[PDB]
């Protein structure tokens, strides 16, 4: 009910770490392939947490 909204911008990442690590188990992406977010790169990124 009180989700937190955090920015990601002006930064470089490696989306391998999140996907491959077994700690994050429940994985599903709508319109984007997982293995490919290494090469696809986005204008701004919005992280909502709860």
């Amino acid at each position: 009910y009180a989700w937190n909204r955090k920015r990601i911008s002006n930064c470089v990442a490696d989306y391998s770490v999140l996907y491959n690590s077994a700690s994050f188990s429940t994985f599903k992406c709508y319109g984007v392939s997982p293995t490919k977010l290494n090469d696809l790169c986005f204008t701004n990124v919005y992280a909502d947490s709860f």
């Binding site: 319109g31 984007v32 392939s33 293995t35 490919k36 090469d39 696809l40």
Partner: protein
């Protein structure tokens, strides 16, 4: 003049139809083929080709 006008209009609309999504995620094919795995890029490309 009118036959040239018609032919230019037809080619103009034919070319302009390329910028059209047609129910796909993005109009340009290399985009959708780069941000998707073959199994679902197949569906998106299939709609585009149709």
């Amino acid at each position: 003049q009118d036959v040239v006008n018609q032919n230019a209009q037809a080619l103009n609309t034919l070319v302009k139809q390329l910028s059209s999504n047609f129910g796909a995620i993005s109009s340009v094919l290399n985009d959708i083929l780069s941000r998707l795995d073959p199994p679902e890029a197949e569906v998106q490309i299939d709609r585009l080709i149709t």
